[PDB]
Structure formats: structure tokens, C-alpha cells
Amino acid sequence: IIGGEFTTIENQPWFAAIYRRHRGGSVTYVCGGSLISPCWVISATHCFIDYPKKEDYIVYLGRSRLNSNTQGEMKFEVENLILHKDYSADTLAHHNDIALLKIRSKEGRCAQPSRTIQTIALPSMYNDPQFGTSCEITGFGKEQSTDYLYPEQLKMTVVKLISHRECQQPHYYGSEVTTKMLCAADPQWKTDSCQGDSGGPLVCSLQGRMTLTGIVSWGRGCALKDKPGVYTRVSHFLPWIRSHT
Template identity: 80%
Template sequence: MKFIKSLVYVSIHALHRYLGKASRGSPSLFLLQGWFSPGLLPCSLLTLQPLCFPANCDCLNGGKCVSYKYFSNIRRCSCPKKFQGEHCEIDTSKTCYQGNGHSYRGKANTDLRGRPCLAWNSATVLLKTYHAHRPDAIQLGLGKHNYCRNPDNQRRPWCYVQVGLKQFVQECMVQDCSVGESPSSPKEQAEFQCGQKALRPRFKIVGGEFTTIENQPWFAAIYRRHRSGSDTYVCGGSLISPCWVVSATHCFISPHSDHPKKEDYIVYLGRSKIKSHTLGEMQFEVENLILHEDYSADTLAHHNDIALLKIRTNKGQCAQPSRFIQTICLPPLYGDARFGTRCEITGFGKEHPSDYRYPEQLKMTSVNLVSHEKCQQPHYYGTEVTEKMLCAADPQWETDSCQGDSGGPLVCTIQGRLTLTGIVSWGRECAMKDKPGVYTRVSKFLPWIHTHTRGEIDLAL
């Protein structure tokens, strides 16, 4: 070992002669300081570099650069508790993200469908814009790992996912810190509080505005399964208890069959998009499908247009409360909001009846309750509207429920609570003057609901 040191000293003195008076300080002293002091990188014995420089491992979050005493080419970051990674850039304590997650440095590594993320230093990712070998990779949280990040300030943390032969950007299954525990977390034991939602009502869906499920957390999306394995959106519904969704019977009646099978349907709660998964959603099988026994349809009107779906996950669980999933209050027996009351409607309905596709994002708008006297006038609907129905319309005839909104909720405030007042049922065209939307009057069907749920739903009858 003395022989190696002497070589280094010779090299030092040779350099000193080369640098002359321009060199600062004593090279020998600098060597000794670098050899023993933490924070200074010892001379490289492999290349016999004559000078020692401060160690620089680009350690983050309080990490310290550590190098071996005689093998200074080998150095690493010594990370404080709760941090790990090549540069101490991974915060193992982070289980959620703040804001849009640009600063998130946790260990979530799957997309919303549970598919694993690709490592940022993998060969396929190196061809993308964001990868572990960018000059600013450390600052962006990218490295030799596959953890979710948001380097380009998108809506939430994301990663690349391999689908077939291609790689796609996918949002990650990681919780927003402002939401709290994930609805799938076993720690969550919260109780349902009907009519409560995370966002304030926003009245500005024909002419409506796009929204998220937090604005209508009781909204249920009902899909029909196909033999091919795909599914098609059918109707909306409303969660009235952890195990029960209420919708419209006409959603399940087709010209081909009056006896739908419960196995043909699935229900999603907590879903904001019609074709893609969203954080916090739950999928359910239909354990029981109950259509009203006296349902009938005229040329236009639907009578007794109400249905019940008992839902369970494939593990036998009912819905769990969260920011994205909540029950809606049922109205008092034969009690409704006053005519003229402003109410909310929500759904994936078309903008116009002739539209080929449903909108991708959930929409909501507001309408006012119309009196029976007015709705039964000849230039409205006449006698087609019965006492078991409600009419509601936008005063300017600009917004309305439309095709695809069927079965969804008409929510009004009754006695200070957001209440399921109606179920989207029928109407002529959409947002047509003097042709308001017609809704099943829920208060008239409370005894029917109580009977068919076998008392599982507590009603003030």
C-alpha cells in the first residue's frame, strides 16, 4: 500500500511542477484532506488522477455521497430513513400525491387497470420523450425504477405500459392526498351519509357541462355484456343503499326480450368516463334484477318505469363509501320538492338524439321542476303525464336529459338534503320547447322499493 501512495505523491509533485505558482495551496495537504475527509472524493487510483475533488453523487433529500477509501471510482448515496434509490430520490413514505403529482416520488407502479409500469431506463422507454437518461432525469424523478411520475405536468402521475407491441402513457393507481384512503383500502370503515358530495353543486346532458363523479357520487353506470367479452353502456342509475341501485325498467326491456338476465349486466360506481377506468371506481355483478311488474309503454310514455338492481362484487361485497361513491337520500313518502325548484341531472347521454356516440365524460346540468297542471296542458304532453311522473325543464329550453341519460338521477334539495326526486324516463326529442323531460316520481314508489328490498333500505314510511 505504501508503494501505491508513493506513486500518487510522485504524480502530485509532478503536477505541482507543471502548474507552477498558479496552483492554489499545498497539493500534498490537499491530497491528505481529500484522502480522509468526508465530502471530498479521494484520488482515483485506477487512473492515478493527481487531484482530489469534492464528491458529487447528486444525492437528494439529505443524502450523503460516500466513496470507498481506495476505490474512489465506486461511490454511492447514503440515504436517510424513508428514502432510497440511486440518488435518494424515492420517498418510501409517500402513498399519495399532492396537486397534480409533479413532485410525487413514491413507489406506485401500476396503472388504473393494475398493469405494471415499464422501467424508465428500459430499452423501449429510452425511445420516448421521458426516460432515465435525460439530462434532467434526476430532477424529474426518473431513474432505474418503474415508479409512477408526472414529469410533464399532466393531470396525475403516469407511466408507460406495454400493451401488445406498443407502449402507452397510462394514468397510475395512486391516491390523491386530498381524497384520503383509497376506497379499496381495508382501513376504510366509513359509513354512508346520503346526499353528501365532495364538490359543491354546479349548475351551469344537452347543453350541460362535463363533470366528474365527485359531483354525483351516487351515479351508477350500467353496462350490458356481450358474448365477445366487450360491454356497452346502457343506462344510468342511483345508489340508494350499499347493495341497491335504482334505475328505469325500460333500460332492460328490448324488442327481442322482455325477460333480461341479470348475468348480462355489470354496474360501475365511481366512474367519470364511459369507456375507461377511473381511480376509485368499483365494479359489481348484478345479484338480483327487479323490474316493475306493472311497467308498460305507450307510443311515448313509460308507466311505472322503475327497476332495482342488487349489486355485489365478485368477492361478495357491497359498495364502500368514498369521495367517489356515496348514496343518495330517498324522498319523504309522497313528498316532493316544490315546483320551480332547481334540480340536477347527470348522465352519459347524447348531445343530440341523432348523435352516433355517447360523450366520453360524465355530464351534468340543471332543470326546474314543472307543475303537473302545466305539463298536462295539450301543447305539452296532455294526459300522457300521470301523477306518478314529474316534469322538469330548463326555462330557456337549452338543457335537458337525452338518449343515454335514462335511468339516471333527478336530484333536488328537499328539507335541506340532496334527494333522489326522479328517474330519467322519457320525453319528446331533447331540449325541445314545450316538451320537458319526464321522470319517474320516486316518492310514489317508496312502498314498492321497501317491499322488494325486503326492508334492507330504511324508509320513513
């Protein structure tokens, strides 16, 4: 997250921290995700496509820091890694950039909700907020495009939804953006998602309910003028989510 503010898991208790085991046993951070039910985390396919084996991944819930444990956290193996059959990657754009992870502990249990662990509601179909609506994004991604490290503490920020028409402009992303994607950005281009935030939540208040509106997918650079963040439009994938859960 470029700009924004540090936070803790209590302010985004559905946030899932996803890591990969190597290859000799070091564990490194991969991507964010969102807990949509006790057994199911939703994320982006591009996070897993190069290493599509479920046994390679570990999922934490209730975690506020990257490389140290948070009191009350839960650790899960991935019982099921489901990537979207119609995934494609452009140079920039990822299409159908959506993935489901079925989580199960070594004791064979799913998530127990707590103060640090809760589910996030899915939107109703084809129902998103209007352009200019402020939403929040959360993740452990880079704080500056030039950074080598990821922040050790969880971050969040606010970005405003951009209309498909505006995002379609050549000055922005041309036809790289489809109606299954949402754009969002700061009016000053001051704050944004970045590398390491992929898979995490874009959350909007809709009807007085906190709703998983988007999943962090791609962008050209980070917090660059005329280059918004691009998000998988969750309200266009409900049957896929329904069917696979």
C-alpha cells in the same frame, strides 16, 4: 345531457354506470342509476326490458368516464334484477318506469363508500319540491339529439320542475303524463336529459338534504320546446322500494 357542463363522479357520487355484455363479449353502455344503499342501485325498467337477464349486466360505481377506468371505481355483477310488474310502454310514455339492481362483486361484496362513492337519500312519501324548483340531472347520454356517440366524460345540468297541470296540457304531453311522473325543463328549452341518460338521478335539495326526487324516464326528442323531460316520481314508489329491498 344536452347543454349543461362536464363533471366528475365526486359531484354525483351515487351515480351508477350500467353496461351490458354481449353476445360475444363486447360491453356497451345501457343506462344510469343511483346508489340508494350499499347493495342497491335504482334505475328505470325500460333500460332492461328487452334483455331481462341479470347475468348480462355490469354496474360501476365511482366512474367519471364512459370507456376508460376511473381511479377508485368499483365493478359489480347484478345479483338481482327487479323490474316493476306494472310496467307498460306507450309510444312515448313509460309507466312505472322503475327498477332495482342488487349489486355484488366477484368477492361477494357490496359498495364501500369513499370519496367517489356515496348513497343518495330517498324522499319522504308524497313530498316533492314545488314547481319552479331547480334540480340537477346527471348522465353519460347524448350531447345533441343528432349525435351518434355518447360523451366520454360525465355531464350534469339544471332543470326546473314543471307542475302536473302545465305538463298535462295538450301542447305539452296531454294525458301521457300521470301523477306518478314528474316533468322538468329549462325555461329556454336549452338543456335537457337525452338518450343514454335514462335511469339516472334527478336530485333536488329538500330540507337541506340532497334527495333522489326523480329517475330519468322519457321525453319527445331532447331539449325541444314544449317537450319537457319526464321522470319517474320516486316519492310515489316508496312502498315498492321498501318491499323489494
